[PDB]
Amino acid sequence: DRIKANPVSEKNIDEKFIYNTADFSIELFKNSIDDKENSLISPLSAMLALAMTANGADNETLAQMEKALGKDISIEDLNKYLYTYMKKLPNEEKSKLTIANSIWFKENDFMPSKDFLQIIADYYKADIFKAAFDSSTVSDINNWVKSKTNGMIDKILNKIDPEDVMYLINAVAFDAEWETVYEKASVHEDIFTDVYGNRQKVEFMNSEENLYIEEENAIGFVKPYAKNHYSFVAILPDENISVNEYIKTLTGQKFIDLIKNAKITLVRASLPKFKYEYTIKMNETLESLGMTDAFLPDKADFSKLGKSDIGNLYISEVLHKTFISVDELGTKAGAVTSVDITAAGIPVNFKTVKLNRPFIFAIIDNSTNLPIFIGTVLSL
């Protein structure tokens, strides 16, 4: 409306972005997973929401965020890279991917920096909303994410704290068909009882696949979506190692390369059918990547976002909500990352450790091998 997006230069996607963003993605993953059997993160979604927020950070808060997201990529080069990456990611019938960004800020106690709002509009194509931050803003925001995730996630907020001044929000929506769908005759329902004694029913889908992943600590396959822009990666870690041991061996470059080195050979693949929602408060996960100052009211420097009259601004939470449905016809997947900028108080977080062996999966962009989504199902 007022802030008018200006033309910007592209920065061609290259080995540096691919491998650095791979590094962030896998590290985000291995510090995200917990006791939850079903989990799902979108490193892309969190990347974008956090890249937007980094543009308001200064000094040590900035330096920690640049390092956590881009390693050695400056926020300026990250701005160019992500703009380019959003621009060129394929999106068409049977192979849909959309990405949306928004900034919501308080009309009252907060004056945003004109330069911050501009750089966001320029590189992130963000919707900018000046708001009251009352109950109606809650419905406004949930309307936005419901729309931008195609109904996969209809709510991100339920209430706004009186000392909140800004929400930086990214949404992602993925809707694609398999290149080769499953006939129902390829699907078979097995009944079992879980660890806790509960009857579970999992439908398994059988296919012949032609990309076979073979690491020293894992087996897997890659199944393409129609139009060949995106694939589904499935990884079965070994039993001859600890679950904590396997996660620790995993790296960004290894993940890129293991898909790259997938041998063209026939593989009888079994893919579980699954549909779930997942929520993770990403505070502790991001602190463990070296982003610590942003979450500490006495330390955070977010003075590039703008002027506050209510106190020192800091991130109270990075909320990450996801949804996925893998069935016979394809995959629907949605993600929201909201970053909450507030004046007062202090977050309190608990974190659980993963103890069970997971069936690992990822939805990957075929031209980079970067995981748009990465998650876990089942207890092997």
Automatic annotation (TrEMBL):
- Give the organism the record lists: Caldanaerobacter subterraneus subsp. tengcongensis (strain DSM 15242 / JCM 11007 / NBRC 100824 / MB4)
Q: Which Gene3D superfamilies match?
A: Alpha-1-antitrypsin, domain 1 (2.30.39.10), Antithrombin, subunit I, domain 2 (3.30.497.10)
Under which name does UniProt file this protein?
Serine protease inhibitor
The family database entries (InterPro entries) matched by this protein are listed as: Serpin_CS, Serpin_dom, Serpin_fam, Serpin_sf, Serpin_sf_1, Serpin_sf_2
Which protein family is named in the record? Belongs to the serpin family.
Q: Name one GO cellular component term.
A: extracellular space
Q: Where are the transmembrane segments?
A: none
Cite the source lineage: Bacteria, Bacillati, Bacillota, Clostridia, Thermoanaerobacterales
**Record CDD domains:** serpin_tengpin-like
Q: Which top-rank group of organisms is this from?
A: Bacteria
Molecular functions per Gene Ontology: serine-type endopeptidase inhibitor activity
